[PDB]
Amino acid sequence: ATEKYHEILKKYFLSFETGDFSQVQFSCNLEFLSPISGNTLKGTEEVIPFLKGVTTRVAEVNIMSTTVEYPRASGVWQMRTTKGTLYTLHNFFRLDEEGIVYVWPMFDPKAVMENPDALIQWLTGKDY
Amino acid sequence: ATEKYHEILKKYFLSFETGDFSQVQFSCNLEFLSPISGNTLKGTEEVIPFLKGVTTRVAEVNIMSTTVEYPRASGVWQMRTTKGTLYTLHNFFRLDEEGIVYVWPMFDPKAVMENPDALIQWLTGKDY
Structure with missing residues (x-):
């Protein structure tokens, strides 16, 4: 079952390559803490359109590690x-x-400190 | 023991509130990926002085969750x-x-985006 949970995270990450989130196992109680809002996005109905929008501005994805407890x-x-x-x-x-x-999602600070304005533009698509 | 590692992480975080890192169990092969350098800090000899410096600009510490695999x-x-x-x-x-x-260490982006220069001044102590 733990191996199954690692696979679920990897399928979440790989969905950003295509914008197809249909292979990801999401709970009916899904919540998302967005970088662009204080209040969480609630449900696949709110989360998925946000993620699909971001995927339109993603060129490549690299998975480094998954950890499960x-x-x-x-x-x-x-x-x-x-x-x-x-x-x-x-x-x-x-x-x-x-x-x-x-x-x-949280971020390594180097890419953000190197061009602060670029992150909000990539996240929102406004002035991108 | 798995709980041993949860305790080690809690001792790591709490050291930022006290400034004493002596209760933290660190390996002789310790490496640290710093927000202010491309090359990792190597050993407690390089790491601890850096963390001690950051802790002089830390007030409260709050631990939200720990995960070990x-x-x-x-x-x-x-x-x-x-x-x-x-x-x-x-x-x-x-x-x-x-x-x-x-x-x-990686960061939630909101506090970073709100004031990019403030992060570098807090990390480096220069112009803080």
């Missing part, structure tokens, strides 16, 4: 934007019996 | 700077038989 999980990965900025992320996850129930 | 671990926590800004971090760790052997 059920119901908690974390993963280190990277996204190369369509302008070429390489962000490195450390996502916090909560898991339940239906898969991923909480996602909270 | 030996030899990997992670934890979500927070530090208030001595000026009052709350940073939320998601540290990536590796572990060995002597405790923590690798540390890589």
Whole structure:
């Protein structure tokens, strides 16, 4: 079952290559702590359109590691934007019996400090 | 013991509130991936002086969660700077038989985006 949870995180990360999130196991109680909002996005109905929008500005994905101590999980990965900025992320996850129930992306600070304005533009697509 | 590692991570985080890192179990092969350098800091000899310097600009510490799947671990926590800004971090760790052997701090992007220069001044102490 733990091996199954690592596979679920990897399928979440790989969805950013295509914008197809249909292979990801998401809970009916999914919540997402967005970099662009204080309040969480609630449900696949709110989370997926946000993620699909971001994927339109992703050129490449690199998975470095996944860590699981059920119901908690974390993963280190990277996204190369369509302008070429390489962000490195450390996502916090909560898991339940239906898969991923909480996602909270955090970032390695170097790419952000090197061009602060670029992150909000990539996240929002405004002035991108 | 798995709980041994949860305790080691908690002792790592709490050392930022006290400034004494002597209770933390660190490996002789410790490496640290710093936000202010491309090359890792090597050994407690290079790492501890850096962390001690950062702790002079730390006020409160809050530990939110710890996750261990030996030899990997992670934890979500927070530090208030001595000026009052709350940073939320998601540290990536590796572990060995002597405790923590690798540390890589990453950050929730909101406090960073709000004031990019403030992060570098807090990290480096230059113009803080």
